[PDB]
Design a protein around this ligand. Sequence first.
Ligand SMILES: CCCCCC/C=C\CCCCCCCCCC(=O)O
Length: 133
Amino acid sequence: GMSNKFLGTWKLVSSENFDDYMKALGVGLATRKLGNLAKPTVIISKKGDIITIRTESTFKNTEISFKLGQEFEETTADNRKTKSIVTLQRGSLNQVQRWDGKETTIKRKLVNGKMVAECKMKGVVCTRIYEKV
Ligand SMILES: CCCCCC/C=C\CCCCCCCCCC(=O)O
């Protein structure tokens, strides 16, 4: 199952190419400016077979809960209404969002004690590094 080492509170410390990823998602400039500057936390918790991922910024939060393998509805931080699914593959949490005939992936893995999120939209890739608080 998901490693217990995912559980807890993670703080963003570095990011690369997030602006273009947000462009590719259709996010407008004003919102991209906040996404490029903010350093969110990501809180991962689990109760039974339900994993919860809560993202906190001072001006925008989000939260998803899911069971591995099972599709769920998600309203994203940029206000997309998606059908999403998270699977566990080779120790990574692999989240796919689908909306409007579009698709994006957000893979979260543990590497050297950090959480690495890799995001892909139509070949535009970004990486975000999180440390464990
Ligand atoms: C929720 C707190 C940050 C919100 C500020 C920016 C608003 C919208 C940008 C939309 C980006 C959607 C991707 C969010 C990041 C997914 C990968 C990650 O968790 O690091």
